[PDB]
Symmetry: D2
Subunit: 388 residues, 4 copies
């Protein structure tokens, strides 16, 4: 068993992840800044497929049009030198004090207009660099108090913003799709579109829903105590999993962004099983923060660990589904029956089917055990490589 | 200030609420069963508008077709005697052991067929009694372990079930709509459609989405640590708030179903403000459990408290919105600007607007305080009746 | 690698665990009751060391003094027939409606007196059967509302109860110790002594603290989002880990009592590592509920899984600590330095040590990485059996 | 009803609270720094009694011995000019990168020695300024991963540190006591001594326990989903409430530090009731952060709101306890009986009391309702000023 990643595994990382300097709400940075070129090179050596960026990670805020040009050219050369791709980009609408009440849903109308112009400028840059997905994380869209934000008006403003971005992309003929990244809270007390479900429901109200999907993050759904593989299954069912952010989280608390596989390990196993079996073909993107206890050697070790843990879990999930004892257990728990229509015979035949009600033996049905505990222990054995 | 409810306030209660005998997972019942007729009469005396029921609350499971007839006739006479209405009904698909792996998404296909027939039978009864809304709470739809439930297949089965019920209602020409009640967990480890957002997104995939809305419950969204007024605002924005369940919950733990106003009192204030200001016109339904510490006098006191606390909060929220100091504060925090379109001028004019980017003074914008803390203290003063 | 338990592994189970009939707050029992004799025999065949009981699990509430005698004799014969031991016993002070406001801290004084007499009667029975530890879980001690319970008076009543039980045991010359089992909530809204920490602090205020320790349960500390291995380390540090309850829990929600190893698997690994390395010598007791989806075959599979997962994790934790690469990593992260006194030289020498402050190079110290991410990935590799 | 604070209400604020510049983990500061002298003056005008500080709030880290002298003299003059007191001080052992793995429990021994010297230096300064309480918040004491911290060794190091500080204070003859401030997590993944209970238990293992108490913070116990008034009652029962930090928190999430009265309003009511009725005489200290949405006018409004909400709740709790209808309800719920000993007659008389068991009517006892819901609605009415 060797678990070395290759660019064909499509592992990607944000510039902001390995480049996080370790500033947290109670302390100063513990690491120096990383040159984006440096990160691209180090990640390529680790076996990564590509990188992602916020506008402000690549071009420092307030850069002159020409300093801009210069930063991009250096970056493009590093991409050329290494074979690294840029599959996704996003906008920083949360760090600058002007976004303290939000970007697209700020109460001040002039700030909402600025937020849109800042976004459109980076969409152009993303397309140039070849990105196929443009992510939006509305980190400042929300409130700490009840009267500060009329949420129906804010949702109108949010729809207005995304509809305009969709108009722009279509008018320019760009081949790029949008992905909304939910988070329930932090840094705002409550953030709008707090879960995968709220984001999926919102998308259905946009003018061109086909251009929008979700970019769920493992830790964010877990901050609401939700089951991440279930949420991803709903997103896949809807045809809306455009991208995904992988990391780890230990429960309901502040957003930890631990390396993937840390946090809830069994959820990571069921997630990998689902992604691989559904044939998800997008990037396996890591949105994580190497802990501020680490020096740069620790940063690269943490990034390598993300990829390693994905490949180990992939191997264990494949072994699980391939095991004939597990296929027998699946039939014993009637997963095969779950996949069959309830009533392909139609409503009238169901209504006339006396075996469905009048003469249904409910006591016999109730006595049938589901055998889920044996199945789950087979999954545990596979995960731990303890199959005897 | 007098806070007496009248049937015009549209307060409703489930039979199962005041009739809960106090059985919990660690203990026996502490109260005798209540005769549904008794409950209808006592609730009418308290000023309630009507009652709701599960099929099994009104007709004990396994009743003969004629015992059935008899239970309904007694109930109808109590409704006639008191003027009480029956605006909503629902199905019990969770108590009987045959539903231990779910009703609509049970792995066993014969159980899913039985679940549909049990539901259809009660829809007929609901229409007869005049209900306008039929609620579905999929309490057993979910799993304790990862391999027990393929969630895409389960969502296919769930869609299949709701599509069939919609076919039935339309074919019968019934004027009744469906409302899905989300809950994140309990009694299953994770329940499918765990929040208002997931339910709204699911509805958009049904064949006739116009027949389906949500029935959110205060405590259930709070079990995921979510902001209930925000979720209700999203549901109103979508035109899908068909019904609502009011109660109290203290945080992320087991489903407490405390009387309304208990639990998170400020959230109750912002909820009432939103409902009243959005002109929600459905029932104000209480889905609550009088604590098992109480005798029947305590049960009626708890039910009266539900209604009282709604009317006090209604008065305080109205006073808040009517106060000219608060209207000035709202303008100071630019709630008026939030309600104005960001770019009614259109995309091209936004792109050509140099005041939106090239010459936007971001530092000046960032320095503007939002004045949210003064506004929130005005709301606190109003809530506590301390306005000086 | 074979993972078969033997009675020498000291695995124990409560009668109430495999015997749980599957009644939950939303549904009826799905399994018939188990005869305690049946359970003892089945558990012995699985490799268990012994069983535990509540008074009411073994002798149905309200039994005549002679029916009592009969139930105990049958039980003792099953113990004799199988070699099974009874290391712990406890009292049911939560199921009967008379305990709806608590046992030791009920507001009614006559109920508190009854609670003490019911307890003392079972202590006598526990000693007869050879138990060394008597557990107290104050499941009903607490409140749903603020005014219902003066908590200082309730703590006085709680101390009074435990002091009296300690007087009784000493006066009778019994060799038995007490263990308090914390839980933060459920079935009460908030339960008194909600965590391992509150229980340890309370014990220090009893008249004979040496007779009392804690019986922490994995899932219960996790219901407060706490780190269970940390809490156990504090209990070991204090010399108060008298017993332990092993199971699994997925986060902050209702008390799931899943089989051990389910729920937070990495926490289970760090717990086993700590128990084995601290040389904890008491029973490895499982307080778990086989899910109500299961028939009796599923019940025994779930119980076997508890033991299996302990032995797999024991093997992986031992391999981790024995690996020379891990010992090197531990030194690299300065775990050796953590175990050395900070200032064995004493206060004055610390005050006079200029290398401790005046001439301490804080920048050099701050630049040293802790190398925790490499260490944690070594632990992950060991846990998953992926060491290359 | 007028709710103006005076210095006699003993309201205090940390320099770091109104002086928080609004830097959060996702964004830059939104406010300029405040001169400590400026804060003292503004707080005095608001009616505050005094201020508290971390060493680094008052003297910027790395200050020369003489720059030090200068900062203190300016501060002392502002205190003299306004009549403001300094009742508590504390050490910053969390911001500087050298504390990234902790201060007292850092794995590096030289960092632990530095942490102690930095603390001792500020204790001297605290005594000079008249502080009576010295707080310790071990924000960096903890871990993100299982192997990084042996918690028994860390607790040995923690005890060693506090024992040395107690030696120092006694040797110097200072009249100052220590208060440990628990927090469950953030900025570390898990923090040692995570709740009031763990801190109380730890204190009992110090060499001179009488010198140490707790400084609980409303939001911190709520981050573990615990009931703060209950925890404070346990701390009062133990004689260990040396100080308290007041603020608001909405549930289990990141540490919000909202103004007092925000967050869980009913918990704030029950807390004030308990503090006032137990005659707590220390400072009413606010550890809060004015939201980063605010300008300086908003900062002062938020600080004023802290004090206002305390005085409103004080008035409502006093009215509640003074109301004869409430005293009757308290007797009806048998709070009077809770305060009476269970068995002042002693163990033998309890054992011989047949009314306690043999002839106890359990059914009659069980039928008695506790009347807690009526009592809680009286408390609600009082809180909302709706008593009819
Ligand atoms: Ni995150
Ligand atoms: Ni992300
Ligand atoms: Ni509920
Ligand atoms: Ni409900
Ligand atoms: Ni439990
Ligand atoms: Ni237990
Ligand atoms: Ni805090
Ligand atoms: Ni604090």
């Amino acid at each position: 068993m060797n678990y070395q990643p290759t660019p064909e595994d499509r592992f990607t990382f944000g510039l902001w992840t390995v480049g996080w300097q370790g500033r947290d709400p109670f302390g100063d940075a513990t690491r120096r800044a990383l040159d984006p070129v440096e990160s691209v090179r180090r990640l390529a050596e680790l076996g990564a497929h590509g990188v992602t960026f916020h506008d402000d990670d690549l071009i420092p805020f307030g850069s002159s049009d020409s300093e801009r040009e210069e930063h991009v050219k250096r970056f493009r050369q590093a991409l050329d030198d290494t074979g690294m791709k840029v599959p996704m980009a996003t906008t920083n609408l949360f760090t600058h004090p002007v976004f303290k009440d939000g970007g697209f849903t700020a109460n001040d109308r002039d700030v909402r207009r600025y937020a849109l112009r800042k976004t459109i400028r980076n969409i152009d840059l993303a397309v140039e660099l070849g990105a196929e997905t443009y992510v939006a994380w509305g980190g400042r869209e929300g409130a700490e108090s009840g009267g500060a934000k009329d949420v129906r008006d804010a949702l109108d403003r949010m729809k207005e913003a995304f509809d305009l971005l969709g108009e722009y992309v279509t008018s320019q003929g760009y081949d790029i799709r949008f992905a909304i990244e939910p988070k329930p809270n932090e840094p705002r007390g409550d953030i709008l579109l707090p879960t995968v479900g709220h984001a999926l429901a919102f998308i259905e109200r946009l003018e061109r829903p086909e251009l929008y999907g979700v970019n769920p993050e493992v830790g964010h759904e877990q901050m609401a105590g939700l089951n991440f593989p279930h949420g991803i299954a709903q997103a896949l069912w809807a045809g809306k999993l455009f991208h995904i952010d992988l990391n780890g989280q230990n429960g309901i608390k502040y957003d930890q962004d631990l390396r993937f596989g840390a946090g809830d390990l069994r959820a990571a196993f069921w997630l990998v099983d689902l992604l691989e079996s559904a044939g998800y073909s997008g990037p396996r993107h890591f949105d994580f923060k190497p802990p501020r206890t680490e020096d740069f050697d620790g940063v690269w070790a943490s990034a390598a660990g993300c990829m390693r843990n994905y490949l180990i879990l992939k191997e264990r999930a494949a072994a699980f589904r391939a095991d004939p004892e597990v296929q027998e257990a699946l039939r014993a728990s009637r997963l095969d029956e779950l996949a069959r229509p309830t009533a392909a015979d139609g409503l009238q035949a169901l209504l006339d089917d006396r075996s469905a009600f009048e003469e249904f033996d409910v006591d016999a049905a109730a006595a049938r055990g589901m055998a889920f505990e044996r199945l789950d222990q087979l999954a545990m054995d596979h995960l731990l490589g303890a199959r005897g």
